[PDB]
Amino acid sequence: MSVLPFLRIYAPLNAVLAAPGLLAVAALTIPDMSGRSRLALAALLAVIWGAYLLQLAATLLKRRAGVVRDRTPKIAIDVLAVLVPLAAFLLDGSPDWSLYCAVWLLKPLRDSTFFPVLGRVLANEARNLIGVTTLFGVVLFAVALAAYVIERDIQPEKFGSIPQAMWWAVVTLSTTGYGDTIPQSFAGRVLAGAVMMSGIGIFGLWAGILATGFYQEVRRGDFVRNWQLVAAVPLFQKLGPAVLVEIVRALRARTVPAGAVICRIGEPGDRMFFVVEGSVSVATPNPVELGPGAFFGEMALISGEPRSATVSAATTVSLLSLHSADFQMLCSSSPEIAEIFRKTALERRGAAASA
Amino acid sequence: MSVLPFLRIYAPLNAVLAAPGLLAVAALTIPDMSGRSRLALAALLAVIWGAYLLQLAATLLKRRAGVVRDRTPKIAIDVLAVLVPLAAFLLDGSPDWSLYCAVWLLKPLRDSTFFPVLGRVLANEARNLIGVTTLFGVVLFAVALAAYVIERDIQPEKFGSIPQAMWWAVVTLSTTGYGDTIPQSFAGRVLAGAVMMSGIGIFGLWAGILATGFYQEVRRGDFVRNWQLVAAVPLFQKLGPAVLVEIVRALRARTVPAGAVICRIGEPGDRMFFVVEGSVSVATPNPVELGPGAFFGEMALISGEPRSATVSAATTVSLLSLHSADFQMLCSSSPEIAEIFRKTALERRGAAASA
Amino acid sequence: MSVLPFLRIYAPLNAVLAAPGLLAVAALTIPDMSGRSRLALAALLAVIWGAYLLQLAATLLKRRAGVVRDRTPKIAIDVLAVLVPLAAFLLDGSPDWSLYCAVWLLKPLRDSTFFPVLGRVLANEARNLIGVTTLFGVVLFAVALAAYVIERDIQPEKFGSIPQAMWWAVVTLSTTGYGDTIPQSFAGRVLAGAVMMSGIGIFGLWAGILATGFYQEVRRGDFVRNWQLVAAVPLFQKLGPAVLVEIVRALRARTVPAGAVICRIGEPGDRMFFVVEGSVSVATPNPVELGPGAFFGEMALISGEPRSATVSAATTVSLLSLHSADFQMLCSSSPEIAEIFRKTALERRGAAASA
Amino acid sequence: MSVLPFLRIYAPLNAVLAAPGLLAVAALTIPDMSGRSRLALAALLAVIWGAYLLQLAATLLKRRAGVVRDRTPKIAIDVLAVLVPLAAFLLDGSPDWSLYCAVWLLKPLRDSTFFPVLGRVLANEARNLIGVTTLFGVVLFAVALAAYVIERDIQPEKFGSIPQAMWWAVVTLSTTGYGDTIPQSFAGRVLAGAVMMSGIGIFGLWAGILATGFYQEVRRGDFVRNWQLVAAVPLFQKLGPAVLVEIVRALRARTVPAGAVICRIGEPGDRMFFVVEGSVSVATPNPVELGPGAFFGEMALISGEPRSATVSAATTVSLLSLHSADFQMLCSSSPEIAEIFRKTALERRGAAASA
Ligand SMILES: [K+]
Ligand SMILES: [K+]
């Protein structure tokens, strides 16, 4: 609620071409299709092939920043990015070579930061998941068997066996309801009366396991990235020890591109920022262009008013961001700091239009 | 659990007529319907047309409070509120002009406060959503393909292609179970064994993303609206800095209309209020009518007893509200304040019936 | 994880007979059933009729504790508990009079404490629910219409109208998948690609609204009931102000019946209790029977050992309960208290077997 | 996100053979199967029979550590682990004796630690579950009846009775959508419009009940196991009282096996450990092999750098683990401790390669 994400979070074209790339597939998958566009896109594969392959060698020029690096992950596909289609072309002479379009799907994952964030936590908590995964299979076969108990008499064709009903368990437990084969008797239908009750109790926990500290990690991800930009601020030599733990959970940093807006004038004032790298366009008669290591919004928050400037991203800025309460908090935290923000709430009244 | 919402939260008639308005639609959508009521409601469209259109120009009299305002949102439909039906009437001579009853649906959203609250946060957290949205599409096509691997042999008619099975993925992953086309073999059925497991793991996070800080924002929404009504209280010059952060998370403010009840006598005492604007009817022999800047309930809470007055909304009041624990908290917070609430717990014993 | 619920939480027989009572229904609902047991249970209705009716008048003797009471809720059915069957017997001469077995279903709700806990909170938070409830209907008809756009050509029989497809929305949005009528075209199937995504995003919030402060209320329910049993403890004149807020969130109180066990000897020590009303059976050579206002377990927790006594519920006791960490917390909170628990950790070593 | 689970959390072979054991079942469940492998696996039952039975008596040698033990749970199946097949062999002469492969399913649960963790909490919170369980059945039959109201006219075959529609309730309420029997009329279809809305509101709470303090218990499970390894650290005589409550929620301990890696050199430094039992391989010219009661990572965290050693599990170690923020926290908590970690951040610079 308090952050300005701009400049193309979905930036790298390496990520991009997988999307139109794999949509090339389906038209090869279909009868009675003209050969015209059929092969038009095999070229587009060759483009994306050639595109990464053009990109490839410069990546294989991995002498840039060659001091200490661990790039087996990022490279792991780039190798396969171009090899698999090639051997696919020859050994798999039939058109199915395209079905090694199973490949590029990792390329988004090549630079899907927020994906390692996933894998980081499974190696702490899957202790639970396994015993649950058992406990799932506990309740599967314990319950799945109870079907074979019954309708083997009059539904051999459907429930003439164990796994045929195990099939009817997970669909039945995992919230689905396909609608293929359902009992005809009383008690065999009774037994379902605890099942959805169960699995919604199960996944109520089991899925709960994921969001559990996933949130913690992302709540943690916003500190690990932001114990940086702390000493960069000229003022933070006085901040007491535990003050910062109270704060940095909320402070998120994002980048803005050049040319963009930061806050428009007259819109309702709701937030204030700390600038630490880049520069701005403080839209005033004398533009008070504050570069790395500044802030703005105190003019709007102490007064509870609209914006006093159409601040715009003159350059690419590294931002923080902050709403009132936690600034009210910090204003509550110390009279030391509100003084200068009292003074600044007068300085930037005259300094905004003046030099 | 601690708040009195009265006076028509769903107030504005602009919001209201969309509901009966669009129910006018269906009777135009049906064969063998008499023309009688068929056109009876085309008038009702003209009413609602004329109604907003009556409302319209006074809104276009936007010279009221014309100092600094940003009303492109609120106006964005009012324009289209009446234009689209008009051109619809002529160019679309056929009855389908009514099918530009797609229009009024924003009119509730015109004044759906709590809807901007939605949009505020997506622009902080969708960083996650996108990489998840990929990760969804990751697991879609990676898995969706695995179907075409198999039953192309004996189900061309159903799984003779890729997207025909991608269809069977999302229904299969997104908890649904339509029941159109399901495999017949072993391993192709095996592969589902991780799928619902997956998607319930996915949306366990992905939907989790929404409630994540949506709660934070609404937990924040109750502070931003309520750092107001703080200095309005005559007593709060002494309250220490961090005291208020501890409190205002819970304190919600809502309005009551004139004529209504506030707390009935004899019902079990569970809460106390702070009055800051309006007036009451303290139901006693001498009504102790306390207007802006007062409170009541300490008589009931320190003693743990029923109500000592049928307090009623003599006027439209701006209320706070509070349960014991957090007043017990504040009574724990300082002996300074419990003194006057000790005294008040004697003053309003004699002052309730006396003058 | 830290509480001993015994003595029949599902106690009152008023609650009980609704269950077998309404199971009497179905056998009246069925052809080709013998009249034998058919009317056997109409008596059982008359029993339960007569049973509450026997109970009834003593309830209508509401002169017990007649000082200040608000019993319109509890009585609201007791009236109808016996009247509705009666007029049902005569005006509805046909067997359908039994279909006013719609009635007793409130009788569990008559004394379903934890049900008012539900209703308490909806009157704080439904502010959200309504705008969501709109937002649901927003996305319903906005999206539902998009079906009528399309398959009216070749599925009049199924999608020849608006609401016929609105039907296919909620089933489609609300996680269900009935399996009646599904499209045949491409784009009309495409549009589903955001739908389950949506509704699982919706109810990810909307259901989230319920557990949101429901938890808060039950987390609150355990304080409101337990600021009691605080001053009852002889030791708690020294406990500082904010100490208790830290604690009482976890401390749950429940009753045990006479004759039952409290903690068995030799089982692993994991918890300690505070006795405040009732008495025990401290299973030792000289039973150290401590009545109201005592505790035990410090012998097991400071040492990290099994139980030193088969404490058993000699009488009906009002208990608290507590695990280590929060006692370790309190042992961390002050050296004042650990002294007496150090001394008690020696006194009850010799006092356990001695007098 | 901060823990190294190694050495076979799914260790005991008692747990293992249940999995292949019960997969032996299905081939006995099927017609037209050769007798060859049919009886090949009846042996495998005899193996697993003989295997536990081999294991059995040594367990019945329960004189190991015979001072105070409560092993009725662990033994409860071991008895039945071998008896049930035996009587099954004779009384059930027909092949169905194998259908007492319902038995081993508890054997994983015999040593499914994290399963008692489940059962611990249901005996605190099911107070809610019951009243909900009623409230479920409240809304079941109240609503289920509403179907019999209607389509008894034209669907006797499907809705000619009460429970036939109660069936259509839970499937309808519990998120499923089987697809057997659905109405044909307007209002009977209308009534569903609140149902999925309801049950997703219900299980939004009811499943919520589970994760509610399940999380608390596992958040508690990580303290109860870890108030240990506290005094084992030589340094923690100075740590203030409430310091530890702030910490131990996150500190998880897990074991590593001998031969394994602990942290590889050059990988990005993100965490630090406290060694309290075992020993390491500090990969340096002079290996600084620190055994019980040590730590490492401060070299990487204060500087924000890669690893300074390929530390590897020379032996089986009992570990803690910790990320920066909470070490930054502790570094914020006191200048007393950062001194020695300042000194250690110089000592292990020269001591790493030297002796
Ligand atoms: K479903
Ligand atoms: K279905």
Side-chain angles (χ1 to χ4, degrees):
Chain A
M1 59 188 287
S2 181
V3 182
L4 294 176
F6 294 101
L7 184 63
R8 56 181 74 256
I9 298 168
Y10 185 75
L13 296 174
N14 193 4
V16 173
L17 297 172
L22 298 167
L23 294 174
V25 173
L28 292 174
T29 67
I30 300 165
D32 295 330
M33 295 299 294
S34 68
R36 292 181 181 176
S37 296
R38 186 177 174 87
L39 296 171
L41 280 293
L44 183 63
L45 292 172
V47 176
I48 297 169
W49 181 63
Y52 295 162
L53 185 61
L54 187 285
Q55 182 60 256
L56 181 58
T59 61
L60 280 75
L61 191 150
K62 62 181 183 292
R63 296 288 185 274
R64 292 180 181 175
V67 296
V68 177
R69 293 179 293 177
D70 186 75
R71 301 280 77 77
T72 301
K74 291 182 182 178
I75 299 164
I77 308 151
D78 299 329
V79 180
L80 296 175
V82 293
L83 294 173
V84 177
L86 182 62
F89 181 75
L90 298 171
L91 293 175
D92 189 358
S94 67
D96 296 333
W97 62 268
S98 66
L99 300 170
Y100 295 94
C101 287
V103 176
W104 287 268
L105 288 172
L106 294 175
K107 294 296 296 185
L109 292 175
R110 187 177 176 274
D111 193 358
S112 179
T113 60
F114 179 72
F115 183 75
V117 178
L118 179 65
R120 186 178 294 108
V121 67
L122 282 76
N124 186 2
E125 296 289 326
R127 189 265 299 161
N128 292 315
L129 294 173
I130 295 168
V132 173
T133 303
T134 60
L135 183 61
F136 181 77
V138 169
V139 179
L140 193 146
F141 183 76
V143 174
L145 179 59
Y148 183 80
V149 174
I150 298 163
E151 296 298 329
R152 61 183 184 178
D153 297 332
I154 55 172
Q155 294 179 357
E157 291 81 3
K158 285 84 169 70
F159 289 169
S161 67
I162 301 300
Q164 288 182 358
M166 297 174 72
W167 183 246
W168 183 69
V170 174
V171 182
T172 308
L173 186 66
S174 66
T175 321
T176 296
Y178 281 176
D180 59 355
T181 58
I182 296 164
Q184 293 182 358
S185 71
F186 183 77
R189 284 182 186 183
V190 171
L191 182 62
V195 175
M196 296 74 170
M197 185 180 288
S198 66
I200 299 169
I202 295 174
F203 297 151
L205 293 174
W206 181 70
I209 304 304
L210 297 171
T212 306
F214 179 82
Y215 176 73
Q216 190 281 130
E217 182 171 0
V218 180
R219 179 61 64 193
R220 183 58 178 273
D222 293 330
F223 181 81
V224 300
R225 294 179 66 188
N226 295 315
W227 183 67
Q228 292 81 19
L229 302 166
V230 177
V233 176
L235 183 61
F236 293 178
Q237 285 71 240
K238 299 290 186 184
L239 292 178
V243 176
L244 299 167
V245 176
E246 299 170 353
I247 297 165
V248 180
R249 291 177 185 276
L251 291 176
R252 185 174 295 172
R254 295 293 179 85
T255 302
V256 64
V261 177
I262 297 169
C263 64
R264 182 175 292 170
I265 192 166
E267 292 184 354
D270 59 356
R271 68 183 67 190
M272 68 181 284
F273 298 165
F274 289 170
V275 176
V276 180
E277 182 175 359
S279 66
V280 298
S281 178
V282 174
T284 57
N286 288 316
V288 179
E289 184 173 1
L290 294 173
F295 61 97
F296 65 96
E298 71 284 18
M299 295 176 68
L301 293 175
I302 297 167
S303 69
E305 294 182 352
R307 295 292 181 186
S308 66
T310 300
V311 182
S312 296
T315 60
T316 304
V317 176
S318 183
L319 295 172
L320 292 174
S321 66
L322 181 62
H323 288 178
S324 178
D326 291 329
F327 182 76
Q328 181 62 255
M329 186 183 289
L330 183 63
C331 291
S332 72
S333 298
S334 178
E336 184 176 2
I337 295 168
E339 183 63 24
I340 296 168
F341 294 160
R342 190 269 300 161
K343 293 180 181 181
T344 305
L346 294 174
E347 291 179 353
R348 293 178 182 173
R349 293 183 183 174
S354 64
Chain B
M1 59 188 287
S2 181
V3 182
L4 294 176
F6 294 101
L7 184 63
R8 56 181 74 256
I9 298 168
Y10 185 75
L13 296 174
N14 193 4
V16 173
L17 297 172
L22 298 167
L23 294 174
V25 173
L28 292 174
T29 66
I30 300 165
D32 295 330
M33 295 299 294
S34 68
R36 292 181 181 176
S37 296
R38 186 177 174 87
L39 296 172
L41 280 293
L44 183 63
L45 292 172
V47 176
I48 296 169
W49 181 63
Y52 295 162
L53 185 61
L54 187 285
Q55 182 60 256
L56 181 58
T59 61
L60 280 75
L61 191 150
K62 62 181 183 292
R63 296 288 185 274
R64 292 181 181 175
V67 296
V68 177
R69 293 179 293 176
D70 186 75
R71 301 280 77 77
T72 301
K74 291 182 182 178
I75 299 164
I77 308 151
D78 299 329
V79 180
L80 296 175
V82 293
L83 294 173
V84 177
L86 182 62
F89 181 75
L90 298 171
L91 293 175
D92 189 358
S94 67
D96 296 333
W97 62 268
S98 66
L99 300 170
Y100 295 94
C101 287
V103 176
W104 287 268
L105 288 172
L106 294 175
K107 294 297 296 185
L109 292 175
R110 187 177 176 274
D111 193 358
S112 179
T113 60
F114 179 73
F115 183 75
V117 178
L118 179 65
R120 186 178 294 108
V121 67
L122 282 76
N124 186 2
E125 296 289 326
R127 189 265 299 161
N128 292 315
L129 294 173
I130 295 168
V132 173
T133 303
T134 60
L135 183 61
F136 181 77
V138 169
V139 179
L140 193 146
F141 183 76
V143 174
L145 179 59
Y148 183 80
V149 174
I150 298 163
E151 296 298 329
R152 61 183 184 178
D153 297 332
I154 55 172
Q155 293 179 357
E157 291 81 3
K158 285 84 169 70
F159 289 169
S161 67
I162 301 300
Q164 288 182 358
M166 297 174 72
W167 183 246
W168 183 69
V170 174
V171 182
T172 308
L173 186 66
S174 66
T175 321
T176 295
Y178 281 176
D180 59 355
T181 58
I182 296 164
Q184 293 182 358
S185 71
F186 183 77
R189 284 182 186 183
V190 171
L191 182 62
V195 175
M196 296 74 170
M197 185 180 288
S198 66
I200 299 169
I202 295 174
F203 297 152
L205 293 174
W206 181 70
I209 304 304
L210 297 171
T212 306
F214 179 82
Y215 176 73
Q216 190 281 131
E217 182 171 0
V218 180
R219 179 61 64 193
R220 183 58 178 273
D222 293 330
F223 181 81
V224 300
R225 294 179 66 188
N226 295 315
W227 183 67
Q228 292 81 19
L229 302 166
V230 177
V233 176
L235 183 61
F236 293 178
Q237 285 71 240
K238 299 290 186 184
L239 292 178
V243 176
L244 299 167
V245 176
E246 299 170 353
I247 297 165
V248 180
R249 291 177 185 276
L251 291 176
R252 185 174 295 173
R254 295 293 179 85
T255 302
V256 64
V261 177
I262 297 169
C263 64
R264 182 175 292 170
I265 193 166
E267 292 183 354
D270 59 357
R271 68 183 67 190
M272 68 181 284
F273 298 165
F274 289 170
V275 176
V276 180
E277 182 175 359
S279 66
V280 298
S281 178
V282 174
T284 57
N286 288 316
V288 179
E289 184 173 1
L290 294 173
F295 61 97
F296 65 96
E298 71 284 18
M299 295 176 68
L301 293 175
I302 297 167
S303 69
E305 293 182 352
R307 295 292 181 186
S308 66
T310 300
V311 182
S312 296
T315 60
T316 304
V317 176
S318 183
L319 295 172
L320 292 174
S321 66
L322 181 62
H323 288 178
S324 178
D326 292 329
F327 182 76
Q328 181 61 255
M329 186 183 289
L330 183 63
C331 291
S332 72
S333 298
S334 178
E336 184 176 2
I337 295 168
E339 183 63 24
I340 296 168
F341 294 160
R342 190 269 300 161
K343 293 180 181 181
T344 305
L346 294 174
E347 291 179 353
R348 293 178 182 173
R349 293 183 183 174
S354 64
Chain C
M1 59 188 287
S2 181
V3 182
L4 294 176
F6 294 101
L7 184 63
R8 56 181 74 256
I9 298 168
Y10 185 75
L13 296 174
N14 193 4
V16 173
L17 297 172
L22 298 167
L23 295 174
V25 173
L28 292 174
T29 67
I30 300 165
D32 295 330
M33 295 299 294
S34 68
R36 292 181 181 176
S37 296
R38 186 177 174 87
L39 296 171
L41 280 292
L44 183 63
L45 292 172
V47 176
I48 297 169
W49 181 63
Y52 295 162
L53 185 61
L54 187 285
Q55 182 60 256
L56 181 58
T59 61
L60 280 75
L61 191 150
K62 62 181 183 292
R63 296 288 185 274
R64 292 181 181 175
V67 296
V68 177
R69 293 179 293 176
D70 186 75
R71 301 280 77 77
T72 301
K74 291 182 182 178
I75 299 164
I77 308 151
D78 299 329
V79 180
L80 296 175
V82 293
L83 294 173
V84 177
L86 182 62
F89 181 75
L90 298 171
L91 293 175
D92 189 358
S94 67
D96 296 333
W97 62 268
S98 66
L99 300 170
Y100 295 94
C101 287
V103 176
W104 287 268
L105 288 172
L106 294 175
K107 294 296 296 185
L109 292 175
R110 187 177 176 274
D111 193 358
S112 179
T113 60
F114 179 73
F115 183 75
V117 178
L118 179 65
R120 186 178 294 108
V121 67
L122 282 76
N124 186 2
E125 296 289 326
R127 189 265 299 161
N128 292 315
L129 294 173
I130 295 168
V132 173
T133 303
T134 60
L135 183 61
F136 181 77
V138 169
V139 179
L140 193 146
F141 183 76
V143 174
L145 179 59
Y148 183 81
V149 174
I150 298 163
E151 296 298 329
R152 61 183 184 178
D153 297 332
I154 55 172
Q155 293 179 357
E157 291 81 3
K158 285 84 169 70
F159 289 169
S161 67
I162 301 299
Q164 288 182 358
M166 297 174 72
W167 183 246
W168 183 69
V170 174
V171 182
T172 308
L173 186 66
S174 66
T175 321
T176 296
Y178 281 176
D180 59 355
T181 58
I182 296 164
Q184 293 182 358
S185 71
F186 183 77
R189 284 182 186 183
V190 171
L191 182 62
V195 175
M196 296 74 169
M197 185 180 288
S198 66
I200 299 169
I202 295 174
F203 297 151
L205 293 174
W206 181 70
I209 303 304
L210 297 171
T212 306
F214 179 82
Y215 176 73
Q216 190 281 130
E217 182 171 0
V218 180
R219 179 61 64 193
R220 183 59 178 273
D222 293 330
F223 181 81
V224 300
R225 294 179 66 188
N226 295 315
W227 183 67
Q228 292 81 19
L229 302 166
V230 177
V233 176
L235 183 61
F236 293 178
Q237 285 71 240
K238 299 290 186 184
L239 292 178
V243 176
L244 299 167
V245 176
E246 299 170 353
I247 297 165
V248 180
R249 291 177 185 276
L251 291 176
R252 185 174 295 173
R254 295 293 179 85
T255 303
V256 64
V261 177
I262 297 169
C263 64
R264 182 175 292 170
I265 193 166
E267 292 184 354
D270 59 356
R271 68 183 67 190
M272 68 181 284
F273 298 165
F274 289 170
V275 176
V276 180
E277 182 175 359
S279 66
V280 298
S281 178
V282 174
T284 57
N286 288 316
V288 179
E289 184 173 1
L290 294 173
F295 61 97
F296 65 96
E298 71 284 18
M299 295 176 68
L301 293 175
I302 297 167
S303 69
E305 294 182 352
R307 295 292 181 186
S308 66
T310 300
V311 182
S312 296
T315 60
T316 304
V317 176
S318 183
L319 295 172
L320 292 174
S321 66
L322 181 63
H323 288 178
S324 178
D326 291 329
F327 182 76
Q328 181 61 255
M329 186 183 289
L330 183 63
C331 291
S332 72
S333 298
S334 178
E336 184 176 2
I337 295 168
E339 183 63 24
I340 296 168
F341 294 160
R342 190 269 300 161
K343 293 180 181 181
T344 305
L346 294 174
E347 291 179 353
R348 293 178 182 173
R349 293 183 183 174
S354 64
Chain D
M1 59 188 287
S2 181
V3 182
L4 294 176
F6 294 101
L7 184 63
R8 56 181 74 256
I9 298 168
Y10 185 75
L13 296 174
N14 193 4
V16 173
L17 297 172
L22 298 167
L23 294 174
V25 173
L28 292 174
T29 66
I30 300 165
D32 295 330
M33 295 299 294
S34 68
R36 292 181 181 176
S37 296
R38 186 177 174 87
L39 296 171
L41 280 292
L44 183 63
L45 292 172
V47 176
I48 296 169
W49 181 63
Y52 295 162
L53 185 61
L54 187 285
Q55 182 60 256
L56 181 57
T59 61
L60 280 75
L61 191 150
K62 62 181 183 292
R63 296 288 185 274
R64 292 181 181 175
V67 296
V68 177
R69 293 179 293 176
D70 186 75
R71 301 280 77 77
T72 301
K74 291 182 182 178
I75 299 164
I77 308 151
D78 299 329
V79 180
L80 296 175
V82 293
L83 294 173
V84 177
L86 182 62
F89 181 75
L90 298 171
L91 293 175
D92 189 358
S94 67
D96 295 333
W97 62 268
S98 66
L99 300 170
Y100 295 94
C101 287
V103 176
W104 287 268
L105 288 172
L106 294 175
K107 294 297 296 185
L109 292 175
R110 187 177 176 274
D111 193 358
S112 179
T113 60
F114 179 73
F115 183 75
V117 178
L118 179 65
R120 186 178 294 108
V121 67
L122 282 76
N124 186 2
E125 296 289 326
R127 189 265 299 161
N128 292 315
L129 294 173
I130 295 168
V132 173
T133 303
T134 60
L135 183 61
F136 181 78
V138 169
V139 179
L140 193 146
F141 183 76
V143 174
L145 179 59
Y148 183 80
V149 174
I150 298 163
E151 296 298 329
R152 61 183 184 178
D153 297 332
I154 55 172
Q155 293 179 357
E157 291 81 3
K158 285 84 169 70
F159 289 169
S161 67
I162 301 300
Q164 288 182 358
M166 297 174 72
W167 183 246
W168 183 69
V170 174
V171 182
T172 308
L173 186 66
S174 66
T175 321
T176 296
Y178 281 176
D180 59 355
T181 58
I182 296 164
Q184 293 182 358
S185 71
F186 183 77
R189 284 182 186 183
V190 171
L191 183 62
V195 175
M196 296 74 169
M197 185 180 288
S198 66
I200 299 169
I202 295 174
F203 297 152
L205 293 174
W206 181 70
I209 304 304
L210 297 171
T212 306
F214 179 82
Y215 176 73
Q216 190 281 130
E217 182 171 0
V218 180
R219 179 61 64 193
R220 183 58 178 273
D222 293 330
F223 181 81
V224 300
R225 294 179 66 188
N226 295 315
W227 183 67
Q228 292 81 19
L229 302 166
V230 177
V233 176
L235 183 61
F236 293 178
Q237 285 71 240
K238 299 290 186 184
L239 292 178
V243 176
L244 299 167
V245 176
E246 299 170 353
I247 297 165
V248 180
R249 291 177 185 276
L251 291 176
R252 185 174 295 172
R254 295 293 179 85
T255 303
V256 63
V261 177
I262 297 169
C263 64
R264 182 175 292 170
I265 193 166
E267 292 184 354
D270 59 357
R271 68 183 67 190
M272 68 181 284
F273 298 165
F274 289 170
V275 176
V276 180
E277 182 175 359
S279 66
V280 298
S281 178
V282 174
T284 57
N286 288 316
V288 179
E289 184 173 1
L290 294 173
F295 61 97
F296 65 96
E298 71 284 18
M299 295 176 68
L301 293 175
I302 297 167
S303 69
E305 294 182 352
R307 295 292 181 186
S308 66
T310 300
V311 182
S312 296
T315 60
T316 304
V317 176
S318 183
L319 296 172
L320 292 174
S321 66
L322 181 62
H323 288 178
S324 178
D326 292 329
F327 182 76
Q328 181 61 255
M329 185 183 289
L330 183 63
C331 291
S332 72
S333 298
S334 178
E336 184 176 2
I337 295 168
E339 183 63 24
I340 296 168
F341 294 160
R342 190 269 300 161
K343 293 180 181 181
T344 305
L346 294 174
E347 291 179 353
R348 293 178 182 173
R349 293 183 183 174
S354 64

